Design a protein around this ligand. Structure first.
Ligand SMILES: Nc1nc2c(c(=O)[nH]1)N[C@H]1C(S)=C(S)[C@@H](COP(=O)(O)O)O[C@H]1N2
Ligand SMILES: Nc1nc2c(c(=O)[nH]1)N[C@H]1C(S)=C(S)[C@@H](COP(=O)(O)O)O[C@H]1N2
Ligand SMILES: [Mo]
Ligand SMILES: [Mo]
Lengths: 369, 359
């Protein structure tokens, strides 16, 4: 059992896979706090979790070569904090499966969580390694984790050089999560946090940072996490025909009430989350009780972030009167700062991996007598 | 097609709209809120001012000679493009545009960035600053057309904001802002202020009617008795968009093969990564061929023209639908009612075109 050393996890989590460990918090706990407690933050591991002795750990940065200890990472670079939501490419995959079977972890609406991350700015570490603030043409910063497949290939990913060097992009080499040291499942001792970008690129248990003229050659950068036409099937898919998912599109889901519930008549408070990639804020959330025919505007909770740096989700709520003995089909949809919107239905956005599941979330409940 | 004479507003015929990557100056859609100014070029001056910047008064000759000419091929799409689709759901207030309030040109001019830096403004300002524009066109009272963009976009080298005096290789036409306009790539046409008289750096958004009390998106539930422009942000970047230009609604096409064509575009420099095309009303899809050359990442200011040749069977009915996907994997929604708004702006639900196949 290569997973014999994996860490202990909270019992309240909805485990989608044990070995490797993948789990999401239940819907009723998911949006209870703006910052998702470390114990409930969703967990996505492709491989066994590395057991890292903090003292001997070294971060390799291949400059135009650094070997940074955890103590150096902490002391040499000013600590910055960024509150960012990580959403998995597979969040809401369960919706896709309802149309046609897909390949992937059966996530519901909880493959998304939010934390206040603390660490060194990737920008500062790269400038310290001797790299220039700017590089002409399309360059990339590649990441490798300490976790590896049977063949010894590590988990890896990349982001464009521009994003890595940009102060406003808030890309961190994080060693703290919600004020405490990074948990093992979340990348102890160091992970990359890439705000506004799909979770896949936020490499945990970071071993190496390199600059390259090309994207990471990792399996998960080249041959996974892309969107295709709904017509594409396993016999025709060609990962060269689409871009790696970086920024994600606008998203929202209803966390309260839950599907199949019978709610009391009178007033009903509907709640959920909304978020969009690339630091685009959520400017509105529309909520319907009649299956998307008529809408009401939800209250957006929380504090406004600077323009282009809305890395954290918006929690929303709406209290509405409901009549005894009626059926409700509760639907939410969000609008971001570029006026991007969510689509009505899943079949037209369907894909063989069930990624990029952003059609409206629909929750059916009945109202008691 | 002219939607209005006084003031003048017009769009090119759908049959020519997407026939050339660069829209000829004579066909490029025209949206004018006010009478078109008659600008005498020698006496014209562009005023540039603001806190911590030297006030400039630039002649057309100096704008051309002092600043290095930059060329940017950028698509301008009006907020009301495809308004007709909104009116079919419920009547709205606005020009009755069809799919042609969008056009593309190669613009040439001074970088707004260079002009502001020349005036002494810094590359970055803390807080949320804006760059305000005022046109020479004005209402009978005298308020000019105006707009603004965030200071960060104005100063970004990558954002390609121009003070353009050339359009597709020739002098800027009168209807398109002669002698000078702002071109704001990847942003709604409303902010590309024509007949530019002033550029001002300000800590606040432009107080213009068209910045404060127009060009915003609202929930479909909002009506005239409840609309409050303070509740929404000014449209700046636009969402992913596409439409079919060939064939045209109600066409009877010959059997055999059919070449479906159209355009696709997305705001904020996000490239179009795919266009899906259906012939059965959105039940099944095929992938269209994207025409033209790639642009650098984050600077896809120009539309992608697309086409798909498909076999069609005699005597059948088709419902042709297209939808586009951008670099952040944003998508177009299925239907118009849920994106409906009282001004019929931001019309990006799937375009559907019904045709029959002879015989
Ligand atoms: N090294 C390493 N990094 C990783 C992964 C991985 O398996 N190994 N999974 C990725 C995926 S696909 C996502 S969604 C996020 C999940 O971060 P979390 O488990 O801390 O929520 O981590 C990313 N980083
Ligand atoms: N001075 C001024 N500039 C303006 C206009 C206006 O009425 N006056 N209309 C705006 C609108 S709403 C749009 S859609 C574009 C259209 O530019 P075009 O006419 O060159 O296509 O110009 C913008 N610039
Ligand atoms: Mo993921
Ligand atoms: Mo417009």
């Amino acid at each position: 059992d290569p997973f014999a050393g994996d860490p202990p996890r909270h019992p309240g989590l909805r485990v989608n896979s044990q070995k490797p460990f993948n789990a999401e918090p239940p819907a009723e706990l998911l949006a209870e706090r703006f910052l998702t407690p470390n114990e409930l933050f969703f967990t996505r591991n492709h491989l066994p979790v590395p057991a890292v002795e903090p003292s001997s750990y070294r971060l390799r940065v291949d400059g135009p070569t650094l070997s940074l200890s955890l103590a150096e990472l902490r002391s040499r670079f000013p600590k910055h904090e960024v509150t960012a939501t990580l959403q998995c490419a597979g969040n809401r995959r369960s919706e896709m499966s309802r149309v046609r079977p897909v390949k992937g972890l059966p996530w519901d609406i909880g493959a998304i969580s939010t934390a206040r991350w603390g660490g060194a700015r990737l920008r500062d570490v790269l400038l310290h390694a001797g790299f220039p603030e700017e590089l002409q043409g399309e360059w990339h910063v590649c990441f490798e984790g300490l976790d590896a497949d049977p063949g010894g290939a590590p988990y890896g990913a990349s982001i464009p050089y521009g994003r890595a060097l940009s102060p406003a992009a808030d890309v961190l080499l994080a060693y703290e999560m919600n004020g405490t040291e990074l948990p093992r499942d979340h990348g102890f001792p160091v992970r990359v946090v890439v705000p506004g970008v799909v979770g896949a690129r936020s490499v945990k248990w970071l071993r190496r940072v390199a600059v390259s003229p090309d994207e990471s050659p990792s399996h998960w950068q080249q041959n996974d996490y892309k969107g295709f036409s709904p017509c594409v099937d396993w016999d025709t898919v060609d990962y060269r025909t689409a871009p790696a998912i970086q920024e994600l599109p606008v998203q929202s889901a209803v966390t309260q009430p839950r599907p199949g519930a019978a709610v009391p008549p009178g007033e009903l408070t509907v709640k959920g989350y909304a978020w969009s990639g690339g630091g685009r804020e959520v400017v509105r959330v529309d909520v319907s009780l009649d299956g998307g025919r008529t809408w009401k505007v939800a209250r957006l909770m929380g504090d406004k972030a600077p323009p282009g740096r809305a890395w954290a989700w918006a929690l929303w709520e709406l209290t509405v009167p409901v009549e005894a003995g009626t059926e409700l089909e509760i639907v939410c949809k969000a609008v971001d700062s570029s006026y991007n919107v969510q689509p009505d239905s899943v079949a037209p956005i369907w894909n063989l991996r069930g990624v990029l599941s952003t059609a409206w979330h629909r929750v059916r409940v009945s109202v008691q007598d």
